[PDB]
């Protein structure tokens, strides 16, 4: 197979970075390295921040916050509007960096950048809303209201698999809420973050906004830990497959938004439109090479249609074009690294050991074409029961197929796992669709009808329940997590209730 | 005179039996009920074990499986019936509040009335619990956000509001489809037994499931088992919990105390301010989370404000909380008195001047009880003792000149519950409430740090814990959000223009 | 047998005195109370003049000046007390509803319970009535939106819901700081007198102002003076008003009737559909604004659906509404019967087939009363008589093949209150509720055209009038919005970068 | 004085129109005429629509609506975003047309165009919101929700004095709500409307949106009446100083948004910052030559400071630079036409007849410099009582000064007039500011503290009470007036309540 060479990838990365305003000589170094899953090779070395630099960055962000929090929110929205314009102008440059570092095909990388633009649009509108309330008070000659105020520095921890959209959800909303941002991107995807920050620094300069509104800290795990532990960071937002962030921030009386992984199922009922269901399940299971927190990993199929659903999924998986994510023909690019491939192969072998049958895929493709990179065909595994390996999230394209008879059994099977991010049901039956969404239905934070588990849009709150961590980001009123509520009682009567009737004047 | 222990004991037993408590089933020898009025033990109680906690959680979870599909308006009908029974027994319950918490009759009655008011509010919520419907970018699709019952709610309350805090949590949680396991303060079990018996009668009257609410009486080990239960998705603690519950991916509502200040500007109405400050600092013997502990006074009026406050503190009527003439009842126990004396001793060692109060009153009248005059201490700066709250009536007076420095002094402490500003100046009032003003969860103008009501969200920031209870949309913490997209178009349309065709 | 007029009269007088009405003060010779059960007059009543209306408005406006500064939670306390008195007298009031409106006991009881439920909902609203706070583009400024009491509310109700419609309006209006002048149907004055006497007792118990609510009994000239008053900023009319009130810059809430349809798809559960359709078409003798009048059935099941409906209509129990076996009580008067017969005669002249019903029942048993079997008419198209509602139990059956044409048939009429679809198909259900589906204010799935409840906004589109009552945020129509910007910066800053310096 | 010549104005107008994409040969004609208050002269003739053309336009807008209402709202928002970009690009061209037709100074014309851009920003955010509700139902195995649906064709009637912003408030919101628009602009300001429509038609072409989303009908009163009476127009929005629109639309069971004029007051208390109060009152009274519905026309001053407030306002009015609104030095341009000047002079003469004293202004400036145009100095009139002429709105810069003693008297004086649009209070006293805003305070739809009566921002709902007409447009949830509410009960239980327990199956 034809896979881009590491040198050609490095040239495309340097072009994209320079077009987005990154000063290559300023960010290059020998402390860390940028890399690409397309070949598995290092691209070039980078400077690093120390933990001491993290503290300096947090304090500079707090200084900016002291000015930004009294900057009128519609003015803060005008900065985010300028940034959305730069993102639109550089959409393909940023998408190229997403493909290079996350291994996403062109269409998915462009779609991820489009999420950034969409949430910028949403946040500009929010900058004239951020609604609190006015309400009656029981006290004569008083007034009562609830207001929302900027919180402080927001620490953003993102993962390799959505290296730009997750930060954009957090930064666009946080900035219009009067917060500032310190971003710790994945050690696997620093270049996407450098390009994003450079475009925002240009927006900031054009707007005359404070220079410290957003900063990227490049480093390994000690860098992230220092961010998480800062007493100057009242909110930490951590997305990706992290589990220690919650307790450690709680211990210093901080706030967290946590979205920590998913093990997402779809139910296929006897009345399901099978052409629709197969197409939707293929994208949900195989998109991003199965490396979304929202990836479809469990398919719960009614026994009357199980055999035909497996036959059609087997053929679909066998026809998936795997290859270089820069080629328009490709639908499946590589896994992120060798450790991900190892975990996938161990899960598939555990599954057959636990009684399962591998129906399609699972094999490494053209290993000699790019020996450092791991391209795999998505695996389809039929399972007699929801055993230990099925209940574990493996960050790889593995779709386990379980059968059911009663709808309540399908719901129990969906709910049995420790995670709780997203769920779907495919059905033409009005009653089954409502029962799946009812309070005793699927227990996840996202629950869909005739749609798979992935590909949310910006207008809804995004996040999940149980061990997914409970946070919400992006749409609806998820913005409230980035501000503090105040309840204000205002007395204009000139008097106060006298305790026991006694006047001490 | 001070009420006798024998008379207090008989009133407590009468209140309990009238509220439906079976004294034979609850009496024992593992724990004792007590009263701050004399310091004496009332009688012994049965206690629960950690294994009893696990059994109570399983019964609450079984009831939750039925309650969560009971229509919310039907769940509200139960809470309306509970409010009626509370109204019926308002005086009986208030007597137990005075007996166990030591608060004066009028405040005990007000606390029971808070329970009734939150029942009425929750009945209205039972037809709302609003989510949203909104557009989607995909043709032939629909998008909405729905709210669902969460599960078993663990409630941990303190001695100082022994019935209203649980009522905030239980009324809202029950209409939200949740069930409740309640661990009251070991200092105030009798109030909780009475509350639970009245709710159990309402449950019987409604045909509702028996496990909707349960009280577990016990020591620290009982509370820890509740906090650690994997079947308790929400823990509400008022008065270690935070990271423990976060470690098992649970949710918390935390309101952990306050160190509340009011700013007095040069244009303040001094009669209003003095009355407001006395009642917020001395009320409940300084044992409210919202108690006024810091007064930040402009230097040009500081001397006259301290003289007026000194005169008022010297006149405060201290005595038996069953006497209507009493304004200040006793502190809860000897440790509370000891911590108060230690704070005042530290304050004077840190440069402060004791202007009034601090002395113990009529100790021979009840040697086991601690009636103390609230203390007023003028301080040269916001020193260590000022920044850390003592749960006692001590009012520290600090001075300022520029309003931004008064705001900084308000915000400098680790707590963040409530704040107030006394001023006739329109701009000063607004600056105090502005994003760069007071940083607390509650910030008021010309009313004190206890100015709050059922319809407002109640809670604070920083080390107060971040939770919100009672009013506005605090109910959302008792439910789980779901984002639902529905495709009725018969085709796969992917968001953001993604294309997965070959 | 049918209840005797003498027994009905005595029950009415007993109900009225028990609800606090002074029979001596209200009896007269200008108007008469009546009963559809026998058609007979009960006794004579005093009537008000247009000058009495003007005096009632001035008294309501004087009370409004006090009520609008009474804190909303205190206003809610009055409505809670009213709900308690309604609960106390539920059976007495329900008896008057059956006597005057002719509706069966169970429905009369349900209507009084609606009043109690909206009282409970309004008590919750009294702590909400939410406006907004939001950012402003100007530094050192604050922006909010507040809601204020409007003034005197005129309420015009119909015979068919003689107590619940006024309760929707009065409970919400009172907690919103408004006062009420009520003009009930000339056919049902006794229910209104009872309601007002119970509310006046609650007003006395609360120490509230006496003019918060008043009833004016009279003919058309009394209603017109209310509609035309320049001191009545809101007129709510259920069952000329619109442009008249608009001409004096007043506000209206209009719910003027319905011509409601349900669509029956090939996958409909036929037992569910038949039960749902019978109760929505025949209930209240077809005299609900939400009554089912049009059934749009897929051609492949149309024959079997008409046979099942024919069998059910022939079995409907018609009789005295005080007998629990009765499902269909009498029509309100002779004119209602005449209009029904004329519609059925027109339908058959326009090509339709009378499948069942339409005949008058036991006329000799009560020659002044009109008990009729609901009529079922199969129609070849949606002709003139189908498009204009007759306030009578007539169910027209139309057929379709494509769902978009069933939707067009639903939407084609001038009315727009409610609609329903019976289907097992997920996509058909969603299409019916979609922006290009049914155009009505209420659109339901697998429940009939009367499917509504307190927590939902109630009302319709097109010639139904556009108003909304009861639930969600319908309360906003009873208040006035204010947008408030507050400058605390000490400088003039103009929006949009305007510069007026020289 | 130096006033631009009619020929120079015509050249600037033709340049602005052509830059905004208007085809001059297509819109010119001999039925009506464009004009300018700067000289009072006609500029050039225009084609007209007939009433029959109005009906054709309404039906074409309804056809577009049938497609637009199922176009996803975020897609509808993308059109409004493109239109906001064209408005930003042509801001000064449009501002020139606003100056030419309404007579506004450069700063106010640019600010009016900026309102259009701001509401486009707001509406793009709204396109992912348009929030209804989900809520509990009392019925087991049912679900309940409230949804919002597009309404239909919206008829927009605007006035001369805000010839672009009012339509923008209505069109940006209506379009994202899935409605379509037929716009009838003032007969005095057709060119601004032609330019706005041409820019939006370009946005529509770029987006591939339906061609009939917005149309301008140019004509006299018979054209507007036909729009108002159309049974295909479920909402009519009429802004400007109209009073017959309400009843006529009500008679055909349509909906209206009405904002029909104002007679707006500000209260000046003894503690008022007088430098602030005078500066604010001068802009509120004199801006737009007193031709806003929000113009300050009544000043209610405490008797202890009345004399000094009048002295300072007298000097400020005497120093106002009146002249050509294209010159940067000008703060006051001309009144719209001779009829407006006549009404102003008649009001001032009535006022002195009713006991008042003319303290400053009121005289026509340099009549021979532009004999067809009416430039006047704003008039300041001290009045012994709130007499008939004070309670009447005269659409001219006349500021009546009334004195008071008790704050409740000032509030009664504010509330005594038939209008109810906006009110302000200038005070340093916390109690007086709250009392003015309380339920027994000012009765207007807008009530401000230390701000005048004009110059609202886009984020608030705009409109008034009493004879102002009750409508709200622009911000908050004013968008709900452009959609229809539906209450949906969904039964998934398979059963229904059986009446009297009887099962007919
Ligand atoms: N919009 C994407 C985001 C996934 C986020 C993640 O996998 O961490 C989706 O809903 O699939
Ligand atoms: N933004 C302007 C709009 C006025 C509208 C009008 O006068 O018709 C203002 O608030 O003064």
mmCIF file of N, CA, C and O in Angstrom, chain C residues 106 136-138 145 249 271 275 279 315 324 433 435 441 443-446 452-453 457 468 472-473 476 480-481 483-485 487 496 499 502, chain D residues 107 133 137-139 146 149 243 319 439 445 447-450 456-457 461 472 476-477 484-489 491 499-500 502-504:
data_model
loop_
_atom_site.group_PDB
_atom_site.id
_atom_site.type_symbol
_atom_site.label_atom_id
_atom_site.label_comp_id
_atom_site.label_asym_id
_atom_site.label_seq_id
_atom_site.Cartn_x
_atom_site.Cartn_y
_atom_site.Cartn_z
ATOM 1 N N UNK C 106 -68.386 12.253 37.740
ATOM 2 C CA UNK C 106 -66.940 12.048 37.745
ATOM 3 C C UNK C 106 -66.205 13.207 37.069
ATOM 4 O O UNK C 106 -65.129 13.610 37.523
ATOM 5 N N UNK C 136 -24.275 43.277 29.733
ATOM 6 C CA UNK C 136 -24.421 44.444 28.883
ATOM 7 C C UNK C 136 -23.095 44.721 28.202
ATOM 8 O O UNK C 136 -22.032 44.353 28.707
ATOM 9 N N UNK C 137 -23.153 45.381 27.051
ATOM 10 C CA UNK C 137 -21.917 45.705 26.347
ATOM 11 C C UNK C 137 -21.185 46.903 26.945
ATOM 12 O O UNK C 137 -20.091 47.245 26.468
ATOM 13 N N UNK C 138 -21.751 47.543 27.976
ATOM 14 C CA UNK C 138 -21.134 48.758 28.488
ATOM 15 C C UNK C 138 -20.417 48.491 29.799
ATOM 16 O O UNK C 138 -20.975 47.831 30.685
ATOM 17 N N UNK C 145 -33.990 41.864 33.307
ATOM 18 C CA UNK C 145 -35.377 41.902 32.868
ATOM 19 C C UNK C 145 -36.244 41.490 34.049
ATOM 20 O O UNK C 145 -36.018 40.431 34.644
ATOM 21 N N UNK C 249 -55.745 49.351 23.087
ATOM 22 C CA UNK C 249 -54.379 48.962 23.455
ATOM 23 C C UNK C 249 -54.340 48.014 24.653
ATOM 24 O O UNK C 249 -53.342 47.964 25.378
ATOM 25 N N UNK C 271 -58.027 -1.395 19.446
ATOM 26 C CA UNK C 271 -58.717 -1.322 20.739
ATOM 27 C C UNK C 271 -58.416 -0.004 21.456
ATOM 28 O O UNK C 271 -59.328 0.662 21.962
ATOM 29 N N UNK C 275 -61.391 2.996 22.038
ATOM 30 C CA UNK C 275 -61.615 3.549 23.374
ATOM 31 C C UNK C 275 -61.259 5.033 23.423
ATOM 32 O O UNK C 275 -62.043 5.856 23.906
ATOM 33 N N UNK C 279 -64.293 8.166 23.962
ATOM 34 C CA UNK C 279 -64.306 9.031 25.135
ATOM 35 C C UNK C 279 -64.063 10.495 24.754
ATOM 36 O O UNK C 279 -64.659 11.405 25.352
ATOM 37 N N UNK C 315 -73.787 1.398 21.993
ATOM 38 C CA UNK C 315 -73.762 0.921 23.373
ATOM 39 C C UNK C 315 -73.562 2.030 24.396
ATOM 40 O O UNK C 315 -73.565 1.738 25.595
ATOM 41 N N UNK C 324 -73.863 7.104 38.270
ATOM 42 C CA UNK C 324 -72.510 6.709 37.898
ATOM 43 C C UNK C 324 -72.477 5.832 36.661
ATOM 44 O O UNK C 324 -71.443 5.767 35.992
ATOM 45 N N UNK C 433 -45.665 15.464 14.586
ATOM 46 C CA UNK C 433 -45.284 16.515 15.524
ATOM 47 C C UNK C 433 -44.276 17.511 14.956
ATOM 48 O O UNK C 433 -43.998 18.523 15.617
ATOM 49 N N UNK C 435 -42.308 20.353 12.372
ATOM 50 C CA UNK C 435 -42.763 21.699 11.969
ATOM 51 C C UNK C 435 -43.709 21.692 10.791
ATOM 52 O O UNK C 435 -44.592 22.559 10.724
ATOM 53 N N UNK C 441 -52.162 23.931 18.501
ATOM 54 C CA UNK C 441 -51.479 24.263 19.742
ATOM 55 C C UNK C 441 -51.149 23.044 20.585
ATOM 56 O O UNK C 441 -50.189 23.066 21.365
ATOM 57 N N UNK C 443 -50.563 18.818 20.054
ATOM 58 C CA UNK C 443 -50.454 17.695 19.121
ATOM 59 C C UNK C 443 -49.875 16.492 19.860
ATOM 60 O O UNK C 443 -48.769 16.576 20.407
ATOM 61 N N UNK C 444 -50.612 15.375 19.868
ATOM 62 C CA UNK C 444 -50.336 14.238 20.743
ATOM 63 C C UNK C 444 -50.132 12.952 19.948
ATOM 64 O O UNK C 444 -50.505 12.856 18.779
ATOM 65 N N UNK C 445 -49.557 11.940 20.605
ATOM 66 C CA UNK C 445 -49.324 10.627 19.994
ATOM 67 C C UNK C 445 -49.983 9.566 20.868
ATOM 68 O O UNK C 445 -49.647 9.439 22.055
ATOM 69 N N UNK C 446 -50.889 8.785 20.272
ATOM 70 C CA UNK C 446 -51.573 7.664 20.944
ATOM 71 C C UNK C 446 -52.371 8.094 22.178
ATOM 72 O O UNK C 446 -52.572 7.308 23.117
ATOM 73 N N UNK C 452 -54.415 16.789 27.831
ATOM 74 C CA UNK C 452 -53.731 17.979 28.331
ATOM 75 C C UNK C 452 -53.779 17.946 29.855
ATOM 76 O O UNK C 452 -54.581 17.216 30.445
ATOM 77 N N UNK C 453 -52.922 18.750 30.488
ATOM 78 C CA UNK C 453 -52.838 18.759 31.948
ATOM 79 C C UNK C 453 -52.309 20.105 32.432
ATOM 80 O O UNK C 453 -51.835 20.927 31.647
ATOM 81 N N UNK C 457 -48.947 24.472 28.831
ATOM 82 C CA UNK C 457 -49.687 25.626 28.336
ATOM 83 C C UNK C 457 -50.871 25.127 27.515
ATOM 84 O O UNK C 457 -50.732 24.200 26.712
ATOM 85 N N UNK C 468 -52.721 31.374 25.547
ATOM 86 C CA UNK C 468 -52.298 30.218 26.328
ATOM 87 C C UNK C 468 -52.639 30.448 27.794
ATOM 88 O O UNK C 468 -52.428 31.548 28.324
ATOM 89 N N UNK C 472 -46.786 25.795 31.945
ATOM 90 C CA UNK C 472 -45.483 26.325 31.462
ATOM 91 C C UNK C 472 -45.357 27.768 31.955
ATOM 92 O O UNK C 472 -45.589 28.016 33.151
ATOM 93 N N UNK C 473 -44.980 28.727 31.101
ATOM 94 C CA UNK C 473 -44.909 30.139 31.479
ATOM 95 C C UNK C 473 -46.055 30.965 30.891
ATOM 96 O O UNK C 473 -45.877 32.122 30.505
ATOM 97 N N UNK C 476 -46.857 34.708 32.125
ATOM 98 C CA UNK C 476 -46.283 35.949 31.603
ATOM 99 C C UNK C 476 -47.341 36.861 30.983
ATOM 100 O O UNK C 476 -47.186 38.083 30.993
ATOM 101 N N UNK C 480 -46.306 42.476 33.230
ATOM 102 C CA UNK C 480 -45.613 43.283 32.229
ATOM 103 C C UNK C 480 -44.108 43.197 32.430
ATOM 104 O O UNK C 480 -43.615 43.294 33.561
ATOM 105 N N UNK C 481 -43.399 43.011 31.318
ATOM 106 C CA UNK C 481 -41.952 42.909 31.296
ATOM 107 C C UNK C 481 -41.348 44.301 31.380
ATOM 108 O O UNK C 481 -41.870 45.259 30.797
ATOM 109 N N UNK C 483 -37.346 45.999 30.988
ATOM 110 C CA UNK C 483 -35.915 45.861 30.732
ATOM 111 C C UNK C 483 -35.198 47.002 31.460
ATOM 112 O O UNK C 483 -35.446 48.174 31.160
ATOM 113 N N UNK C 484 -34.298 46.666 32.386
ATOM 114 C CA UNK C 484 -33.674 47.643 33.282
ATOM 115 C C UNK C 484 -32.166 47.639 33.077
ATOM 116 O O UNK C 484 -31.519 46.614 33.304
ATOM 117 N N UNK C 485 -31.595 48.784 32.711
ATOM 118 C CA UNK C 485 -30.141 48.938 32.678
ATOM 119 C C UNK C 485 -29.731 49.918 33.768
ATOM 120 O O UNK C 485 -30.357 50.974 33.930
ATOM 121 N N UNK C 487 -26.479 52.017 35.453
ATOM 122 C CA UNK C 487 -25.128 52.552 35.281
ATOM 123 C C UNK C 487 -24.575 52.872 36.662
ATOM 124 O O UNK C 487 -25.151 53.699 37.374
ATOM 125 N N UNK C 496 -23.338 50.792 20.953
ATOM 126 C CA UNK C 496 -22.976 50.702 19.534
ATOM 127 C C UNK C 496 -21.872 51.676 19.126
ATOM 128 O O UNK C 496 -21.726 51.976 17.930
ATOM 129 N N UNK C 499 -21.027 58.354 19.429
ATOM 130 C CA UNK C 499 -20.261 59.419 20.056
ATOM 131 C C UNK C 499 -21.000 60.731 19.849
ATOM 132 O O UNK C 499 -21.174 61.176 18.708
ATOM 133 N N UNK C 502 -18.429 66.889 21.374
ATOM 134 C CA UNK C 502 -18.129 67.981 20.453
ATOM 135 C C UNK C 502 -16.790 68.626 20.794
ATOM 136 O O UNK C 502 -16.090 68.173 21.702
ATOM 137 N N UNK D 107 -21.951 59.392 13.139
ATOM 138 C CA UNK D 107 -21.786 58.480 14.267
ATOM 139 C C UNK D 107 -23.069 57.705 14.561
ATOM 140 O O UNK D 107 -23.013 56.515 14.903
ATOM 141 N N UNK D 133 -39.401 23.230 26.137
ATOM 142 C CA UNK D 133 -39.219 22.564 27.421
ATOM 143 C C UNK D 133 -39.564 21.081 27.327
ATOM 144 O O UNK D 133 -40.346 20.659 26.474
ATOM 145 N N UNK D 137 -45.161 14.612 33.238
ATOM 146 C CA UNK D 137 -46.593 14.463 33.053
ATOM 147 C C UNK D 137 -47.153 13.622 34.191
ATOM 148 O O UNK D 137 -46.462 12.764 34.742
ATOM 149 N N UNK D 138 -48.417 13.867 34.532
ATOM 150 C CA UNK D 138 -49.074 13.093 35.577
ATOM 151 C C UNK D 138 -49.444 11.686 35.128
ATOM 152 O O UNK D 138 -49.835 10.870 35.971
ATOM 153 N N UNK D 139 -49.333 11.383 33.834
ATOM 154 C CA UNK D 139 -49.807 10.122 33.277
ATOM 155 C C UNK D 139 -48.670 9.116 33.220
ATOM 156 O O UNK D 139 -47.626 9.401 32.613
ATOM 157 N N UNK D 146 -42.830 20.714 25.234
ATOM 158 C CA UNK D 146 -43.266 21.905 24.524
ATOM 159 C C UNK D 146 -42.234 22.225 23.447
ATOM 160 O O UNK D 146 -41.035 22.320 23.741
ATOM 161 N N UNK D 149 -42.334 26.028 16.633
ATOM 162 C CA UNK D 149 -42.301 25.801 15.197
ATOM 163 C C UNK D 149 -42.381 27.115 14.430
ATOM 164 O O UNK D 149 -42.991 28.080 14.901
ATOM 165 N N UNK D 243 -51.439 52.934 14.523
ATOM 166 C CA UNK D 243 -52.370 52.680 15.615
ATOM 167 C C UNK D 243 -53.591 51.878 15.172
ATOM 168 O O UNK D 243 -54.303 51.339 16.027
ATOM 169 N N UNK D 319 -24.889 75.583 22.807
ATOM 170 C CA UNK D 319 -23.607 75.246 22.202
ATOM 171 C C UNK D 319 -23.680 74.088 21.210
ATOM 172 O O UNK D 319 -22.659 73.763 20.597
ATOM 173 N N UNK D 439 -42.309 47.593 41.368
ATOM 174 C CA UNK D 439 -43.622 47.453 40.702
ATOM 175 C C UNK D 439 -44.508 48.684 40.787
ATOM 176 O O UNK D 439 -45.323 48.898 39.877
ATOM 177 N N UNK D 445 -41.857 50.088 29.608
ATOM 178 C CA UNK D 445 -41.200 48.845 29.224
ATOM 179 C C UNK D 445 -39.696 48.865 29.417
ATOM 180 O O UNK D 445 -39.089 47.802 29.580
ATOM 181 N N UNK D 447 -36.776 50.893 31.883
ATOM 182 C CA UNK D 447 -36.586 51.787 33.023
ATOM 183 C C UNK D 447 -35.141 51.690 33.493
ATOM 184 O O UNK D 447 -34.702 50.616 33.907
ATOM 185 N N UNK D 448 -34.417 52.811 33.461
ATOM 186 C CA UNK D 448 -32.969 52.830 33.607
ATOM 187 C C UNK D 448 -32.556 53.688 34.800
ATOM 188 O O UNK D 448 -33.308 54.556 35.250
ATOM 189 N N UNK D 449 -31.338 53.438 35.294
ATOM 190 C CA UNK D 449 -30.716 54.198 36.383
ATOM 191 C C UNK D 449 -29.417 54.812 35.866
ATOM 192 O O UNK D 449 -28.518 54.089 35.408
ATOM 193 N N UNK D 450 -29.313 56.141 35.964
ATOM 194 C CA UNK D 450 -28.148 56.921 35.535
ATOM 195 C C UNK D 450 -27.823 56.731 34.054
ATOM 196 O O UNK D 450 -26.663 56.817 33.639
ATOM 197 N N UNK D 456 -30.814 51.869 23.535
ATOM 198 C CA UNK D 456 -30.843 50.497 24.029
ATOM 199 C C UNK D 456 -29.825 49.629 23.290
ATOM 200 O O UNK D 456 -29.431 49.910 22.151
ATOM 201 N N UNK D 457 -29.414 48.544 23.936
ATOM 202 C CA UNK D 457 -28.587 47.554 23.265
ATOM 203 C C UNK D 457 -29.405 46.318 22.894
ATOM 204 O O UNK D 457 -30.513 46.100 23.389
ATOM 205 N N UNK D 461 -34.972 42.803 25.579
ATOM 206 C CA UNK D 461 -36.216 42.977 24.835
ATOM 207 C C UNK D 461 -36.544 44.460 24.762
ATOM 208 O O UNK D 461 -36.448 45.173 25.767
ATOM 209 N N UNK D 472 -42.745 43.373 21.982
ATOM 210 C CA UNK D 472 -41.307 43.311 22.246
ATOM 211 C C UNK D 472 -40.580 42.753 21.025
ATOM 212 O O UNK D 472 -41.046 41.796 20.393
ATOM 213 N N UNK D 476 -33.522 39.167 24.476
ATOM 214 C CA UNK D 476 -34.093 38.195 25.430
ATOM 215 C C UNK D 476 -34.791 37.103 24.616
ATOM 216 O O UNK D 476 -34.198 36.615 23.641
ATOM 217 N N UNK D 477 -36.014 36.698 24.976
ATOM 218 C CA UNK D 477 -36.805 35.743 24.211
ATOM 219 C C UNK D 477 -37.929 36.417 23.419
ATOM 220 O O UNK D 477 -39.008 35.843 23.246
ATOM 221 N N UNK D 484 -44.742 29.484 16.762
ATOM 222 C CA UNK D 484 -45.920 28.992 17.459
ATOM 223 C C UNK D 484 -45.538 27.875 18.424
ATOM 224 O O UNK D 484 -44.747 26.991 18.085
ATOM 225 N N UNK D 485 -46.096 27.943 19.633
ATOM 226 C CA UNK D 485 -45.861 26.946 20.677
ATOM 227 C C UNK D 485 -46.744 25.727 20.426
ATOM 228 O O UNK D 485 -47.899 25.868 20.025
ATOM 229 N N UNK D 486 -46.187 24.528 20.609
ATOM 230 C CA UNK D 486 -46.979 23.299 20.625
ATOM 231 C C UNK D 486 -46.699 22.529 21.904
ATOM 232 O O UNK D 486 -45.548 22.438 22.346
ATOM 233 N N UNK D 487 -47.763 22.000 22.505
ATOM 234 C CA UNK D 487 -47.675 21.133 23.675
ATOM 235 C C UNK D 487 -47.924 19.698 23.223
ATOM 236 O O UNK D 487 -49.005 19.397 22.699
ATOM 237 N N UNK D 488 -46.950 18.811 23.430
ATOM 238 C CA UNK D 488 -47.017 17.438 22.924
ATOM 239 C C UNK D 488 -47.032 16.432 24.072
ATOM 240 O O UNK D 488 -46.048 16.319 24.812
ATOM 241 N N UNK D 489 -48.114 15.660 24.179
ATOM 242 C CA UNK D 489 -48.177 14.500 25.066
ATOM 243 C C UNK D 489 -47.994 13.240 24.229
ATOM 244 O O UNK D 489 -48.706 13.034 23.232
ATOM 245 N N UNK D 491 -47.840 9.120 24.395
ATOM 246 C CA UNK D 491 -48.205 7.928 25.147
ATOM 247 C C UNK D 491 -47.421 6.753 24.577
ATOM 248 O O UNK D 491 -47.538 6.454 23.386
ATOM 249 N N UNK D 499 -63.260 5.604 30.197
ATOM 250 C CA UNK D 499 -64.270 6.473 30.779
ATOM 251 C C UNK D 499 -65.298 5.632 31.521
ATOM 252 O O UNK D 499 -65.858 4.679 30.961
ATOM 253 N N UNK D 500 -65.516 5.971 32.794
ATOM 254 C CA UNK D 500 -66.404 5.234 33.694
ATOM 255 C C UNK D 500 -65.999 3.764 33.819
ATOM 256 O O UNK D 500 -66.819 2.914 34.206
ATOM 257 N N UNK D 502 -65.375 1.734 31.368
ATOM 258 C CA UNK D 502 -65.939 0.897 30.310
ATOM 259 C C UNK D 502 -64.898 0.653 29.222
ATOM 260 O O UNK D 502 -64.303 1.600 28.691
ATOM 261 N N UNK D 503 -64.690 -0.618 28.869
ATOM 262 C CA UNK D 503 -63.832 -0.993 27.748
ATOM 263 C C UNK D 503 -64.712 -1.363 26.562
ATOM 264 O O UNK D 503 -65.452 -2.348 26.622
ATOM 265 N N UNK D 504 -64.619 -0.586 25.483
ATOM 266 C CA UNK D 504 -65.445 -0.785 24.300
ATOM 267 C C UNK D 504 -64.809 -1.721 23.283
ATOM 268 O O UNK D 504 -65.263 -1.765 22.135
#
